[PDB]
Amino acid sequence: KTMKKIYVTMKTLSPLYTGEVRREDKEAAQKRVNFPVRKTATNKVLIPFKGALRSALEIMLKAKGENVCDTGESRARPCGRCVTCSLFGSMGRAGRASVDFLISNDTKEQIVRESTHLRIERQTKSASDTFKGEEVIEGATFTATITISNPQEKDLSLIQSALKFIEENGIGGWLNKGYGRVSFEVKSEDVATD
Amino acid sequence: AKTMKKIYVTMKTLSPLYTGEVRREDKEAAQKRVNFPVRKTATNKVLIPFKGALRSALEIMLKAKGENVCDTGESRARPCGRCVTCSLFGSMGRAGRASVDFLISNDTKEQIVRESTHLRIERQTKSASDTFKGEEVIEGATFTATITISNPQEKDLSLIQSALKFIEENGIGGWLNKGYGRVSFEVKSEDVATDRFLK
Amino acid sequence: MKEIKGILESITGFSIPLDNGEYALYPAGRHLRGAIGYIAFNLDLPISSKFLDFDFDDIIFRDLLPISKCGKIFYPEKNSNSLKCPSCNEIYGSSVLRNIMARGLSYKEVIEGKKYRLSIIVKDEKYLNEMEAIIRYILSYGIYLGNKVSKGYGKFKIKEYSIVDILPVKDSVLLLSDAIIDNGEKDIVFSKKEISSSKFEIIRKRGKAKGDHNGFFGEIISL
């Protein structure tokens, strides 16, 4: 058969934030930070990728005119004939793409830096509330691996435009503040038998 | 929706600019030399937070005009989700429509950021009582951001440009009462479609 | 009989929700089978046909019970959710489990940066050459065991491919993996999620519980 092996390499252009999801690792950081960055137990920063790719292609392919399943609502069901539902899966059939977490190349204490964010009273022009949050520095390199099995020729082009959308829109959180502006690079390869 | 208004902002400093370093590691490793480091990337370019300045400008001007806007600046003050700043910049429910990027400089720290001596002079004996070092972005540095409104409900560009006029008069960053942060913005909008990247 | 030993390392954490809220601290041979099945079928390796049939055993995929700083694999204790090492005295425990709450969802996961045992006892060298190919694909492109494989969870990567011939060391056994010995006590639940019939079957076979010999679940150890 045929399987695609899109190796994605990200470089951060403006500070990155994806929230920490393990409750115990969160609470063991809520003494110091109030928004800890998602981190492995190997002290590496991992970002969810599949949702971002899917969302970008859903929004784009919908705006182009193609009937796609918007799964950003609380539908709790896609259909089985969507352009994305073939690629990033459906609720009865698995995904052709198996998008991996965008794990880092460097460890934390080399990419993640605590930070200060503010809320400023509009009249007093001074801080009302202050909070700490972690972030990933600019220039930090991340890697992933998309694994589209049964390629459908458009699949690579759809994945790379998705990447262009997540370069305009952003990956992670606080994306309306200026966070998570990234730059991907694609070096694809078609694995076969041995 | 089907289109996206792509505002492209270019800002020139008409006065010294200061926005403080938020990173605790970068700040504490700078207190050896400079008491007030500026916000800098790890690509040695200067970040300025832009969204909150735009939202503060529009909330102040829109409260003044007589329109109904929420104050997302007070302690324990929630957004409304019915105001126009809650539609453009967001609420605790619905996301914002404008994804205001940071104002990232076009040059590096070594060409825009200088250490500067600042004083506190005794009023009676007319002599310095305190000295400190700050970092400041020089006058003539060009910063670039990119506002991107999804679902471009018309009046967006007018509101953003009015907020940029407010920021031009008032200032962006810190030490805005001493003469710092006086800027000049240059809008170059557009309306490119959402589907643009699809080949 | 040419068994491929190794120590896999979790690069990204894995999630195995079993039943009644409890999870599985280490991945099992079931998951190994399933994932190797996928890899084989997606690469059209012939052996894939036999992997559909669960009542097989020309390649027995034993579990991914963890290895320690004491070298020897951790082993299941008597009626305990912990796996004290034979040599040395360190427990694996439920300290690896972490409650994760993400975008409304709430699952549990085992932390990454651990070291587990790879042991695929190949009974007949007929399929050992294809076994070389599946461990080649694992050696390069990783293997994803558990839940949310398409989302990126469970990234195991092998660190050693030691293809060692092994004997059935039958003797007299220890039940190193809870197995369905007719109608024993512990309830064991599996699945055959076959592509090209869209058939997902939650099969259940009650049996004994690990912590108490036709060759070598259904593992055995010297006692």
Ligand SMILES: [Zn+2]
């Ligand atoms: Zn409002």
Ligand SMILES: [Zn+2]
């Ligand atoms: Zn031990």
